[model samples]
Target chain A: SHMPIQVLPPQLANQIAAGEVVERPASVVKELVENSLDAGATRIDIDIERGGAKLIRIRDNGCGIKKDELALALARHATSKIASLDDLEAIISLGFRGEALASISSVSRLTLTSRTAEQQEAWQAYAEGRDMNVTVKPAAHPVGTTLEVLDLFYNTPARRKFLRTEKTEFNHIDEIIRRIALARFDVTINLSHNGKIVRQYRAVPEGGQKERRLGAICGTAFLEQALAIEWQHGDLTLRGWVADPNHTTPALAEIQYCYVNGRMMRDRLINHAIRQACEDKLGADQQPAFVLYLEIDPHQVDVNVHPAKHEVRFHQSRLVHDFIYQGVLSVLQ
Target chain B: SHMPIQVLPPQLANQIAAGEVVERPASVVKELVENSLDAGATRIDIDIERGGAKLIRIRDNGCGIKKDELALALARHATSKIASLDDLEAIISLGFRGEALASISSVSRLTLTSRTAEQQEAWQAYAEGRDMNVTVKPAAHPVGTTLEVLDLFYNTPARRKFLRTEKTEFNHIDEIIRRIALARFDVTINLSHNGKIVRQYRAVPEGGQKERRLGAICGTAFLEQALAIEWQHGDLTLRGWVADPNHTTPALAEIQYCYVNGRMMRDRLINHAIRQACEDKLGADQQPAFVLYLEIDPHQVDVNVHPAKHEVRFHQSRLVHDFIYQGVLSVLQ
Candidate 1:
């Protein structure tokens, strides 16, 4: 019908926004984990059963949600992260859009309890079946937050079927944990698959402790055959290590890690810059092992383009690219 | 300051949503062109100046925007397309988010006038800069809609600088036109670059006119060496042409086009299916030229995954993949 345009239905609109926010069980884990980091959590615990097909439980020791705004935390587009457009231009936290919890609730039987440092008592908010009409109640908890998500994509059988085997799903969750912690050394991470602890990384900070954690994750062999490079020019800073030229094992090339302003980014342009730097030393088949962290003034980059935040649009892309190329090439020479 | 989560500023919030909707000059052209077709437009006119860096003007002969809702048309999340989540399950229109015009206005000097068939006179709505306080007034126009967008990404210098040379920008806009017209044989498209009519295509309806239009856009040589195929299975339908094997010129492989239920998609899964069907006959170095149209029940596919709508997430990914494989394989055999 050619009728007058009206605002879209609430759930229908949220579904579109949530589609990009949560794709699979791994996506559910990523956003919650990022929120935990944003909450200033020193330690976070993650539990997955049946490879997050049945449940995803995460608890974090951080500044919990305020009791007064307990239900507000579960509402879409509600966030303490950014208040204005300028705030987005210079984002400090990893999660900003505030769609993580709301999006997760839209597709799961989600419930969570939280107690802020100033709050006298804990409060819980619960929602199910995409109605998103969250119910709040008084609850007891520590100075932190805990989320219990059962049945990711439960009603959406079509996408539910898209999920692979338990082993495959569990591996993706594990990969997410590793990637999250690579940039976060001050935080403690404990991950469990099913009922057993599968991976644990304690809080590692400062000087030599950094390498110990990197060696544990990246394998000591990569660190042994790696060259650490750190450089800064103007508003851009490039730091981390690249593989030593002519490595005996070509498999180390698989360890390509990069972060921009504390967010994980497997960006092609960033990757291309690194590859160009090592193009001379490495063979066509070999990709150099690199764990590079590039920091840019947030004003010069845009993250809202991709919901996944895996890619970024640099305002001065060529400048950043050349800057990275020179920094890596300088270390190699 | 860590405070209670609150709603983002209205303008700031719209900007975040707009970031993904409009990226470049071509993006603006793509969305407006789509809206015209959605309005049942049979004839559309597009004028670009300075490669859409300075101006982009579009007019369409279709059911116009209601005068009462002229301003509403420039509001985010406002649309007549679908009312509920069920409607999104089977979206037949090209632009549904209702963010296109609103998003374009957010970053440009934008104004539009429209007159529905029932309405006697046209009404106009205008807005400048990020504040979308659209002003509506009486105006003169035909039984259609005309939108004037000047200075695309003018204020967003960060992204404006991202635009390449006029030549490169114009090429992208040109490519968008070709892709849009391939599926729209019933629509007339007239494009002008800086006052000079660069390309024009008259409405070509069903019958042999399809191939005639294709040959004109796809080069007659490609039609001579291509194979026309039409197959239907269950609720799925596959129609179009594939490159004949044992071709001397390898560059014909450049013409790989595929569509899903009227939407343009360069989907990897569909492409892989086509390649797998011809793997035995085609060399690894050569890609076959093919224009594929795969139709599926709207409920079986999801298009909200990408903002640009270049990709879709199929509910039955494997089923759709295998279906395309068999359909292409059947024609070759």
Candidate 2:
């Protein structure tokens, strides 16, 4: 009663793939900004219009791609990050899969412009639809990369139809940028929507500057009520600021930002560990706000487990779980 | 300095895809059982050994694959669910991408045997490693399908090393089965580990039998203290049972199960709505337990947003969020 199996065309396949990676404008922003971070960008600027549905332009000051490799950059499964299985096992970069540019280009009009430090002038590459026919041309000056994505899901109306209101979509994009800004206090990030500056996070050195950045992103009340924590065990290090149990608010309960090895993650195991630690010490009604980071050997954890790279699997999860619990509990005590 | 861009080999590509879908034994079970359900299986028997790292055999009395198309079933992107884009827009079935079997076979030793009602005898297909060279053999089977997966991640020691203890891994498998059983009350599910019966859920028509089955899965106390909720507006319907706020227990907090059109989903928007509604009425310490199901037009939501199919994107997320909030708030009142 069903049709026979058929291998989908490259365009259709990429559209399907895009459906997974490019959920909305916020998702596109997440990929582009992460790419900038992976490229070693110290300063990045993001401009959005109509909730990033009309246009999303991200300019980053980092190592740019070679002009010769620009076309390949728009190809599926082609990457400059990991070459061998060993590289995958010890992945340090955030963008390794090499599907983002290609996936994004499949459903939108994408333009990539870059100029390496060694180059005299920047070159631009334009791509549209799934075939990924990239055309390159000489452009203006910049020792980094700038990507412009226009009309996201323009070709795939079924997907574009699922976009929320401009305000809601912009909120998600704002939240994502806020999370990333919190993760990298050393990197300067500026976000603008509809030609108006929404957020401007300046780069700063560690210590007070970092706390100030956190306060800006998570509100000053959180910083005033939070406790700075830093714990080291063997090769694992856990550091962050968690809200004091005595200082609680309904809005503070919504603040939870956790990063594993510089990548933002939302794992049930890690969540359970934090909740259990808090439950053991704080009152049953108490809720905690935290911006915690976990540092471990790349080989000990697997980030490839999730497509969006939101979840991770630990080689010894129980050990890591217990370590997280102990670290949070110690900080609270 | 990073490596140059190069297209990864097919085997490595399959491995990367597998990393996203096949996390552990439980992940494998989730994919296989969902396939059987999509096949219209009335009865599904799951057998596991050594927490499914050693072996996982699933038998389903559903529509079996044709004799001529056995090998293609394990090929990447080869699917009978949707031949064109229209079928993809309104996906009634759970397994659509057709990547599960290929992803699973790439990491584990997989053998699929099936006999259609019209076929004279059953045929079996065996695949190993990432090459996916499937060999066919004549076999005996009653109009049904049997999938046997042995030694998961046998070839990739790095992934194999990540497997947890048998008990921990089996607990995940048990949890997945429990979640699936809760979703489909009409399907009879039998699960066994090392030839010992772990859980056996029978097919119930409706009414008391359904509630009894729910009680069996989600404790009798939950049903006793739970409030039945049914809210309808336009084409959207939100119906399920949520635990009464006065019924306080730590165990109740762990009982939240949500489904979007029979598929289990753990979405942040839905979670935020539920949490907000509960916070508006209940004590800060009080946790709500719910088995909520939201029914909407398939065209209105996109499930292809995630590889694991755990997350969905709603066209009118704010409307749906407010609806869920008002619905739960009304019930709690």
Candidate 3:
């Protein structure tokens, strides 16, 4: 038996990283939209060409980056979120750790134009390959940022080859926009795919209009099936919607949305709770539709386990588990 | 009306964080064990009383903290994992953020004893309530560290009040031990609650027996029901066990676990995939069991969005979403 050892190139490692973070059009969509949100953007316009395989551009009215920070922003690990490892316990921003831009740039051609309120003109930078190459350019954007990622996975034919058909990919991108639109009630979302407007969700109305806003993205069917779930236990809070037990689908396709705090997540504990609640009412073959939100003290759940922020760690897994289970159960019943 | 604006006391802040990361006896068990893993411990021993509410002690045979690092270890945001913000994108350790010790110390009477391999003698430090009193004494210990926490959430009766019964809390602790054990297969985990040994799992036998190791934690029935899923799509690598499409449970109790890059996570995309895979086979009242592991470049996801690293920001949500969906669906089918 021989020990396995392989020396890899830096470009290879970065490419590998790019593969993890920048998977497809939807990945770029999520990261860019998130960046816009973190920049304090109130309005976001997303334009995609060839279903985001050729080009994806996002323009936002938000706090733009400075000239110096613009260059650093696309570099891996450059962020204003966590000042040090200690700040990991106190993170509040969406674009912390600074891997999104770099990861995007590694696999595609990325151009970023950003202008801060203090600056007279916007600054711009571009990265074309595994090695980050930057050249600042003048841009027309006023006090905001515009990010363009073109030719996704250009260097990696394997990834590009594995991509689905254009329609499928575009549908995926549309799904991404819808989910984000549903999740962020404050931000305005405008989406265009291949020079045609696919969806446009403008600034959401405050207060009582949230349901209407949700209906705009998830459709009226989900809204009709939606049953409100609002519960609070100590510091943990749960507020969301689950489909009526009678209005279930044979497939889990309708299990549309879930969020903790304001960020959308897919949690086993929460899912388990959903299943537990509906155990007696629904047959084993039917999956319920849901759109729910969980609110708790930030300290009660560990949200920093992965770069994607999809996994959540609860302080008391069972407590949270049972709470989610029982809470949803009560609502379903 | 005047807005109520008050800063949290340092102790309160740490306690708040502890609420998130160290929720119960189990959380304490996780933090201590992770610190041991961070300290290069190959073996960890966890003992608990009253499900870790009354007594939680962990001993690890690893590099002990230096006398200077000991106090710093219990300081908020103090960590030996990374030096500056630049390292956030490329975190390599599980305990780099350094909130575990400090958070634990905030709510409980904590005693720590350590002896570095190079040092001739071990030293002990104990603190109760506030920073005004810290007792340091000469002690004897092996080349590692031991931490004991008693009367958890003593400063905050509200938090203690939120705790469930002893058995429920103990089960939570046991769950944490099992997750940590899964993360590190080579390390030995010996867990005892209230003078009763609950779990003792040794390192896996050579020849890559992860299934057997997983079986030890998930149970034989689950192992038999689980389906193997191994997939590599470009840079994303996924390997796990999804329940057979034909088999379903009324609840998600058997939905074992999910991890990405060695960190436990729950993401909507992955969970959706599992749910979709089992939708046809499971009854409307049932859910599936799964233990999925995903490995990818750290740069692909943003791990800093949340404090405990359970949530992540994916650069390509659709890529991960579809991959898991297609991959798991194909496997289970």
lDDT of 3 by residue, B1-333 (tens): 011112234565455456556656677777788778877888888889987789999999988877655666666555667553344556666755556777778878889999888889899986555442466779999999999999987776545655788989988888778778877788888988788788888987566678888789877777787788888988898887886656645443545578878887777777776676567445542456888888877667656544556566666777887777777768855
Query: Per-candidate DockQ versus the true complex?
Result: 0.57, 0.46, 0.05
Using DockQ as the measure, which candidate wins? Answer: 1
Q: Select the stronger candidate by DockQ from 1 and 3.
A: 1
Q: Which stretches of model 3 miss by more than 4 angstroms?
A: A1-11, A84-87, A128-133, A228-236, A250-255, A279-286, A318-333, B1-333
Error of 3 at A185 (Å): 2.1
> What TM-score, computed on C-alpha atoms, does each candidate reach?
0.93, 0.86, 0.56
- Which docking category, incorrect, acceptable, medium or high, applies to candidate 2? acceptable
Query: Best candidate per lDDT, number?
Result: 2
lDDT of each: 0.82, 0.87, 0.72
For A1-333, candidate 1 gives per-residue lDDT tens digits of 365698775555666776777777888899998989998999999999998999999999988988767677887777899887667778888877767777777767788899988889899998644346778898999999999989887755555766889999989999889888898988899999889999888787555458877888889899898888889988789998998757726678878899999898888899888888888545653576899999999888888787667678888888999999899889988
Runs of candidate 2 with Cα error greater than 4 angstroms are: A117-122, A136-141, A161-168, A197-200, A205-229, A240-255, A267-285, A321-333, B128-131, B205-234, B238-256, B267-293, B318-333
What tens-digit string does per-residue lDDT give for candidate 2 at A151-230? 88878888878778899999999999999998899999999999999999999775545877888899999989888888
Q: How much lDDT does candidate 3 score?
A: 0.72
- Top candidate on TM-score is 1
Chain B, TM-score, each prediction? Answer: 0.95, 0.96, 0.90
What's the true lDDT of residue A267 in model 3? Answer: 83
